Amino acid sequence: PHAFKPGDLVFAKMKGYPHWPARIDDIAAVKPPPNKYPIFFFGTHETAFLGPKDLFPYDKCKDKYGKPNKRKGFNEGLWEIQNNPHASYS
């Protein structure tokens, strides 16, 4: 396995939220601190900076975290990561 690179699909964990469908974004923009990545969250289309310890590869982990939730924006995010993970959501 290799380091995360822009375009990689993941589940991303933030304090007080379930593991969320997301992608490593291109920094093309506020630049992350050392060894953290810019993360675009599907569904809510928000951004944050997370280190690998909160980043879970999509296809390994989707059986675990890819099940629908009742949380606002989550199911929308499953749709996005499954149907057009590399589109512009701007």
Partner: peptide, 5 residues
Amino acid sequence: QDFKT
């Protein structure tokens, strides 16, 4: 960028 709180 719309930063998540």
